[PDB]
Design a protein around this ligand. Structure first.
Ligand SMILES: [Zn+2]
Length: 258
């Protein structure tokens, strides 16, 4: 009876195994754009993905992760609210059963069809495993998806999903360029928070881009053909794998722009 997104194992249950679920710095949150203070001391965000090397894509039973070879200094996030340099290890998405929901963060209560999370670890902690033991171990770039025009650079991901339909399936996934998932502007909001899945550790500097990317209805429909279950188990579509907004608890949200 492991955690999931269903009625009996979903977000409202997670606190029993992971009491930090009711902690002081839980994610996601609703971003009240009217209360985010423009911090003119925030430096330009630097997203440097030109040497990124993807390895594999995996259905982990909750989402699918595109994992990177992070053994060298190759795909780094720095600047903005961050001290030091953070290295890309994986990205994944959260999405809905319908276009009207799916994002974890919300913007003045608005939900997007999906949300991309590019997960980076603070290089001063040596690797991901030790970084998640630190309150500033991770920096996650969050990007909203809306349904409209297709995102051409997403199509390579969409096309491999049929090979990882069920929990535990993985495939080789090399030479994927995550620059093709980024919107024009790097305007963002930033706040301190957590992983949005168990173990819900409070190690994340969140950097949520204001500008969504557009994906096609057909692209997100293919996400919704994935399965939460393993092969040879009853089929449960992987949809609505998002945690809802959590209490802000007097954290503050900063803005990179006016
Ligand atoms: Zn996520």
């Amino acid at each position: 009876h492991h955690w999931g997104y269903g009625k009996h194992n979903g977000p409202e249950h997670w606190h029993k195994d992971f009491p930090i679920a009711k902690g002081e710095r839980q994610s996601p949150v609703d971003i009240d754009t009217h209360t985010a203070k423009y911090d003119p001391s925030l430096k330009p965000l630097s997203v440097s993905y030109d040497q990124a090397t993807s390895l594999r894509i995996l259905n982990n039973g909750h989402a699918f992760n595109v994992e990177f070879d992070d053994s060298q200094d190759k795909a780094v996030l720095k600047g903005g609210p961050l001290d030091g340099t953070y290295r890309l290890i994986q990205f994944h998405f959260h999405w809905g059963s319908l276009d009207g929901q799916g994002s974890e963060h919300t913007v003045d209560k608005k939900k997007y069809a999906a949300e991309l999370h590019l997960v980076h670890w603070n290089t001063k902690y040596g690797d991901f495993g030790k970084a998640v033991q630190q309150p500033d171990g991770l920096a996650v770039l969050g990007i909203f998806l809306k349904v409209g025009s297709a995102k051409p650079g997403l199509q390579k991901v969409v096309d491999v999903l049929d090979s990882i339909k069920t929990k535990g399936k993985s495939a080789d996934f090399t030479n994927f360029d995550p620059r093709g998932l980024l919107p024009e502007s790097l305007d963002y909001w930033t706040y301190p928070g957590s992983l949005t899945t168990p173990p819900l550790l409070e190690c994340v500097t969140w950097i949520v881009l204001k500008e969504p990317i557009s994906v096609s209805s057909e692209q997100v429909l293919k996400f919704r053909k994935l399965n939460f279950n393993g092969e040879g188990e009853p089929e449960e579509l992987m949809v609505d794998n998002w945690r809802p907004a959590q209490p802000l608890k007097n954290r503050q949200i900063k803005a990179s722009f006016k």
